[PDB]
């Protein structure tokens, strides 16, 4: 039988922007702007 190759997914709704895309959901992100 088969062996599939893939990657991690989770329940994150954290979104980031890129040059080509907007509102892209990522599994993990780091905020590098200190707001508090």
């Amino acid at each position: 039988d088969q062996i599939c190759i893939g990657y991690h997914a989770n329940n994150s709704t954290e979104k980031v922007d890129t040059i080509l895309e907007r509102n892209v959901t990522v599994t993990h992100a780091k905020d590098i702007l200190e707001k508090t």
Partner: protein, 100 residues
């Protein structure tokens, strides 16, 4: 220490201090936002190429004793048990031992 004290007859100087602050602020804001956007596109492309690279690493070792399925999976033309599956993950699949 940001912020300087100027008298009311120094407005033409206070304004230069303001300009450096606004000037550097636009430089850093523009660069910070493009740095983040450029890095995020590179990051996502990196991750997508890493999983494809893994697929090819596997494809290259499995060679002709498998078929690709077209959905990012492979199927063997021979019985493949835990030792076989572990070898594929390990990069030790003994291709010459198996046949269709």
């Amino acid at each position: 220490a940001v912020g300087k004290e100027f008298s009311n007859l120094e407005r033409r100087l206070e304004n230069l201090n303001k300009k450096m602050e606004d000037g550097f602020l636009d430089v850093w804001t523009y660069n910070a936002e493009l740095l983040v956007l450029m890095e995020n596109e590179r990051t996502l492309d990196f991750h997508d190429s890493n999983v494809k690279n893994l697929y090819d690493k596997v494809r290259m070792q499995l060679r002709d004793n498998v078929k690709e399925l077209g959905n990012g999976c492979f199927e063997f033309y021979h019985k493949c048990d835990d030792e076989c599956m572990n070898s594929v993950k390990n990069g030790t699949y003994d291709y010459p031992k198996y046949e269709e």
